[PDB]
């Protein structure tokens, strides 16, 4: 139980490291690295704009003193106030013109701007824990709050999630067609290069024309045979390459390998005298005049060869020719072996973006936008005027106000789900939401995504099936700063060079080492076992300086070593094997230590025991899946492995940790269960009364006591979800079926899950409208200042401020079914008057209304029973909640059984021997044998009544009993189970669903019932509805219904000749069209809808003329007719 | 089905067949070649496609 | 055995080390359209054969 204890030091909070709720920690930094150092960083610059001369007249940008502060009101002073949440940041632009002289540096100023008291620049800012943010080191603490949301300018809550980068880490393959296949990479500049760099290559491949094994980019870089760039930039032989690219590779490789190997050297043959770099030159001249480039032909080269490889900048020549090599001998493998290659859906291959990052690219880009209009400008002032003036109005309007605004609202590039308006329906959501992963549109459940995302916590319907996923607990994403990256980067490479200076150069028989794929040395395969090991054991003892490095073996036959360390990462802990020993089994003094350590107490004091291992080192590792297995293991047998993984209780997320033994029941059901359970009502806000929000809230809330180590961790199970319920598993009189079921009266009345609901309005009225001096019915809840009364209840009919427009009343009405008490009044005077008010109204449970159990069961309320006309037990206790038992095992929900077990056990003794609340753990993915269950359930019942029958100790542990019937008082057949259990309650209520329609306001084009249930609008009778109509033979019903009304008739004529209808000019009917042509034709009556007018006019806008004609069938007269029978002859 | 496909082969030039039983349970065919020019681009491309 | 051929005309999924050959297959491009006789002597040891 040592591997259970040492995870649960992970979830609490470590003071030490700073780390005061596990959680959302990872968020909390990504944030505060943007905006304490990033954005410094970003802004900071001192940039040439343009040039003249020969690099000695270029006029130049500087951008300094960046300042940032926050607000001077708290964000429930901005959610009252209707305020927004930003702090501000200022700085100063200079651009001058320098000419380089001999004498040295000349500087002439041309203008400078500053912004030290104005909005300059307004980012929006993280609550955080607490309410408190990073820019303000107060030390005040608001209970109970968490934070993770930002407050946009028209003071509404905004919550966002993670998302999957674009760019890849791993080459992309694709067969284009038979025999024809495409590998395709980028690169891109090191944090610490401003602008940013990016090149997309790709490479070809085609059986037919192994001639043309061509790299290509777009209109960045040359086509050309990658063997032949690879001899240029490395400067070796083809049988140099020969023998490198098929020195480990299966036989059916190695063809290949010698018919590209031969087609290179066929092309190197067939010219004259040939010489790569007059090739390459050639090549590069070619290139050049087919564009229209206006550089220099030296200009051109030192740009195309020079910013090649953006993320090997500043290397030699032959590493990148190196780069190349390796890079072909994956793509070749990955053409003979495909399923042994990572897959393009597959989560070795991505990184993920965190708040932090949308607000870095933000910057990026807007700043970028920015210097080039600022260019633009000058260039055309220079064009028309002279002396290189700067217009005003272009170097006041970064535009990063603008791009934080969309950014919030919901767009994001080619994304629109970054940011979304928080639904306040649950507390847990503060977690739920900022922990969850988005992907591009994939759907199936790929097996990378195991052990780091929640297996269950997925969405069961709508456009976004399986494309969500969740942390699990123990699961991190790594943040990093520039300066660390940099410190550490130096640190690796001097390790490399030092301690394997004699075995780093092979490069035709070694193992490529990269460092966020760049390529720095080629180590000797007789040692990479040894360089591997060596390194974890330093990377756990601190000696780079970061314990979150990861390092990845690649042996099938790829035969590479990568390291990374960038953001963007996913990462957990893992228990360390080292030669065939688990080190927490030889370390005697942890297990006397640890409750006295934290986390980083432990990483520090006892290395060797956790390592934090990222995804990509966990798929290509060895891992024993418990510690029970690996101690079952022979000594040999566990010499393979290289990790040890925690219980799986840690494999699952927050919000699935809110259930019970998932593994007992049917998945399907844990799908639903995680649905459900974020849609439980709690204690949502400590802010109740002054919040201006819409909201619902538990009123007597309780604590839930048999419950998992995560759900104490994150406070979910301090804020409540649910109350204890006594519940029967029985029928009753065959009225709860098909999910229904049966409440108790006198539980309602008392207060059983009792909520209330709280509705935000908000109006804006002209003031002249506000203060016009005329009593309308309309206005019996307002007071003399034209305001509606505090604690007033409102109807479907009543106005909340007076708005009267000059003698006619055109204020906007509440139309809810249900009344709502007057909670609070925000008024704001201006040119306009804006009115926002907060109501309340308590909602005991009725018919209809929905809840549901932890393990999925749901169901509405079918029935409400008196306390007399329920069964009863000995005691005289009747259940507050019957439910059908069938449903339990039809859908083999066994955790519900176990559940009900535990809490009767605790409710007999819940306390210590210390005498100290003690609740009872039984984990979603539970492990724990049910004998063993039982067998605390006996102790705890033993110890409450030491003198028990062997009968009645049975009946007590299985929580059966004998239940009277209440009308004659006699026993059923049959002991019942009955006990109680944690109830909860959803937000689907019946008053916010149920609507109807008498009469109403209909669309103009189509004169047809208007739409919307908060507008009196009608329900659509579809076209599937029509057709049963018809399968019933009912033509007179459906023609009704199809129909205009019956009231809305009038008298239609229609011209027979040309079909236009016909006008009413003084009274005679006349068609206007015909009538110009000297005709007289016939007018007829018509009896049609009014859409159908208007689709035929619209056809004959487009040119198509329709003509009815009409029956004139003659006159039919009726006769007798002789006698038939049709009866048999008997 | 080996004696169809190097017949009508557009790389192959000159070629002669046998088969041998190596024992009972093994048999050998045996395949001489000689390619068109160019010479080893053509041999790797046939023993990739065999 | 009798002349059944194939064109570029269901989904296969083969081990891709004989796919290649199989989809070179394929291509008539790559069949003379005339048989070429064997040129290089064997089976000494029979008469048979002529
Ligand atoms: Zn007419």
């Known amino acids: 139980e040592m591997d259970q204890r040492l995870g649960y030091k992970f979830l609490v909070p470590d003071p030490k490291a700073g780390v005061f709720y596990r959680p959302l920690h990872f968020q909390y930094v990504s944030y505060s690295n943007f905006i304490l150092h990033r954005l410094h960083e970003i802004l900071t610059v001192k940039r040439p704009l343009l040039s003249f001369k020969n690099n000695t007249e270029r006029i130049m940008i500087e951008i300094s003193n960046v300042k940032v502060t926050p607000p001077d009101y708290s964000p429930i002073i901005a959610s009252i106030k209707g305020k927004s949440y930003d702090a501000l940041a200022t700085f100063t632009v200079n651009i001058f013109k320098e000419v380089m002289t001999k004498e040295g540096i000349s500087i002439t100023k041309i203008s400078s701007y500053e912004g030290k008291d104005s909005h300059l620049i307004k980012i929006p800012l993280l609550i955080g824990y607490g309410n408190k943010n990073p820019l303000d080191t107060a030390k005040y603490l608001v209970p109970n709050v968490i934070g993770g949301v930002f407050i946009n300018k028209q003071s509404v809550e905004k919550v966002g999630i993670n998302l999957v980068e674009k760019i890849t880490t ?308 790594t943040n990093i700063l520039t300066s660390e990256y940099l410190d550490l980067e130096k640190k690796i490479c001097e390790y490399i060079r030092s301690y394997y200076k004699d075995d780093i150069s092979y490069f035709e028989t ?381 859908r083999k929900t066994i955790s519900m059984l176990i559940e009900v077990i535990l809490t009767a056990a605790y409710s007999a003794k819940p306390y210590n021997n210390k005498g100290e609340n003690r609740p009872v753990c039984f984990p979603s993915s539970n492990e724990t044998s049910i004998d063993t269950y039982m067998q605390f359930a006996k102790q705890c019942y033993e110890h409450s009544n030491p003198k028990l029958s062997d009968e009645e100790l049975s009946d007590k542990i299985f929580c059966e009993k004998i239940l009277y019937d209440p009308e004659t008082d006699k026993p059923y057949a049959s002991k019942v189970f009955f006990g109680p259990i944690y109830y909860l309650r959803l937000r689907h209520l019946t008053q916010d669903k149920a609507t109807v329609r008498c009469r109403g306001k209909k669309t103009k084009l189509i004169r047809q019932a208007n739409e919307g249930r908060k507008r009196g609008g009608g329900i659509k009778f579809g076209e599937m509805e029509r057709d049963c109509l018809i399968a019933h033979g009912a033509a007179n019903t459906i023609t009704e219904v199809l129909k205009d009304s019956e009231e809305d008739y009038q008298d239609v004529y229609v011209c027979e000749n040309c079909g236009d209808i016909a006008a009413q000019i003084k009274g005679i009917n006349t068609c206007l069209r015909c009538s110009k042509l000297n005709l007289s034709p016939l007018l007829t009556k018509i009896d049609t809808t009014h859409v159908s007018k208007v689709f035929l006019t619209q056809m004959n806008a487009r040119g198509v003329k329709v003509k009815l004609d009409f029956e004139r069938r003659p006159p039919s007269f009726y006769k007798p007719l002789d006698k038939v029978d049709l009866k048999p002859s008997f | 089905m080996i004696e169809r496909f190097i017949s009508f082969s557009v790389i192959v030039k000159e070629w002669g067949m046998e088969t041998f039983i190596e024992d009972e349970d093994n048999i050998r065919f045996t395949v001489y070649l000689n390619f068109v020019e160019p010479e080893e681009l053509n041999l790797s491309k046939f023993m990739m496609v065999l | 055995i009798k002349n059944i051929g194939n064109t570029k005309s269901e989904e296969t999924k083969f081990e891709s080390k004989n796919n290649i050959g199989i989809e070179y297959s394929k291509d008539s491009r790559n069949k003379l359209s005339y048989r070429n006789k064997p040129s290089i002597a064997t089976n000494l040891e029979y008469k048979t054969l002529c």
């Open chain 1, 170 to 477: 791993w080459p992309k393959f694709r067969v284009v067609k038979p025999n024809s296949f495409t590998f395709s990479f980028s690169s891109v500049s090191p944090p610490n290069v401003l602008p940013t760099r990016y090149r997309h290559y790709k490479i070809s491949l085609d059986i037919s024309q192994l001639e043309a094994l061509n790299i290509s980019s777009t209109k960045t870089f040359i086509t050309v045979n990658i063997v032949l760039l690879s001899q240029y930039l490395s400067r070796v032989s083809l049988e140099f390459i020969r023998r490198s690219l098929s020195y480990d590779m299966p036989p059916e490789v190695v063809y290949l390998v010698n018919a590209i190997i031969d087609s290179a050297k066929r092309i190197t043959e067939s010219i004259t005298d040939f010489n790569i770099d007059t090739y390459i030159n050639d090549l590069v001249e070619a290139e050049h005049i087919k564009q229209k480039s206006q550089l220099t032909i030296n200009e051109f080269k030192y740009e195309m060869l020079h910013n090649f490889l953006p993320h090997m900048n500043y290397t030699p020549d032959q590493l990148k020719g190196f780069y190349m090599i390796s890079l072909l001998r994956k793509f070749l493998y990955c053409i003979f072996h495909t399923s042994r290659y990572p897959d393009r859906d597959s989560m070795v291959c991505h990184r993920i973006l965190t708040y932090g990052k949308y607000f870095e690219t933000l910057a990026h880009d807007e700043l970028e936008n920015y210097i080039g209009n600022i260019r633009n400008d000058i260039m055309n002032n220079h064009k028309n005027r002279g002396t290189y003036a700067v217009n005003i109005h272009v170097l006041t309007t970064p535009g990063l106000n603008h791009a934080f605004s969309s950014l919030l609202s919901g767009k994001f590039k080619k994304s629109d789900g970054s940011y979304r308006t928080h639904p306040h329906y649950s507390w847990m959501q503060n977690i739920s939401i900022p922990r969850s992963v988005g992907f591009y549109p994939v759907r199936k459940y790929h097996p990378s995504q195991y052990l780091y995302f929640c297996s269950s916590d997925v969405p069961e319907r709508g456009p976004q099936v399986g494309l969500v996923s969740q942390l699990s607990v123990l699961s991190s994403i």
């Open chain 1, 510 to 890: 070694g193992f490529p080492i990269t460092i966020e794929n760049a390529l720095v040395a080629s180590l000797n395969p007789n040692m990479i076992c040894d360089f591997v090991t060596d390194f974890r054991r330093r990377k756990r003892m601190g000696f780079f300086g970061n314990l979150e490095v990861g390092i990845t073996l690649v042996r099938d036959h790829m035969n590479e070593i990568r390291i990374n360390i960038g953001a963007g990462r996913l990462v957990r802990p893992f228990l360390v094997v080292d030669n065939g020993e688990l080190m927490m089994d030889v370390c005697p003094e942890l297990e006397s230590r640890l409750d006295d350590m934290t986390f980083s107490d432990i990483q520090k004091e006892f290395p060797h025991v956790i390592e934090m291992v990222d995804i990509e080192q966990f798929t290509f590792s060895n891992v024993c899946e418990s510690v029970q297995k690996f101690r079952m293991m022979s000594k040999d047998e566990r010499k393979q492995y290289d990790l040890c993984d925690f219980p799986a209780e840690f494999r699952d997320g927050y919000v699935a940790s809110s259930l019970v033994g998932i593994n007992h029941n049917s998945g399907p059901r844990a799908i639903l269960g995680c649905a459900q359970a974020k849609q439980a009502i709690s204690c949502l806000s400590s802010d109740i009364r002054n919040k201006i929000d819409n909201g619902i809230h538990l009123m007597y809330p309780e604590r839930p006591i048999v419950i998992s180590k995560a759900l104490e961790t994150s406070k979910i199970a301090a804020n409540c979800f649910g109350q204890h319920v006594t519940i029967a598993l029985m029928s009753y009189k065959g009225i709860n079926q098909e999910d229904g079921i049966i409440i108790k009266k006198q539980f309602i009345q008392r207060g059983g899950l009792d909520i209330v609901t709280a509705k935000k309005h908000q109006v804006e009225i002209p003031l002249e409208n506000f203060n016009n001096k005329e009593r309308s019915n309309a206005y019996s809840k307002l007071e003399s200042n034209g305001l509606v009364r505090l604690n007033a209840f409102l109807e479907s009919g009543d106005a909340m401020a007076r708005n009267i427009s000059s003698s006619f009343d055109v204020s906007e009405k509440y139309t809810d079914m249900y009344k709502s008490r007057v909670e609070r009044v925000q008024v704001e005077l201006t040119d306009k008057v804006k009115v926002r008010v907060l109501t309340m109204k308590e909602r005991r449970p009725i018919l209809g209304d929905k809840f549901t159990t932890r393990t999925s069961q749901k169901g509405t309320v079918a029935y409400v029973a008196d306390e007399t006309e329920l069964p009863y037990d000995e005691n005289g206790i009747t259940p507050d909640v019957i439910i059908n038992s069938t449903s339990i095992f039809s």
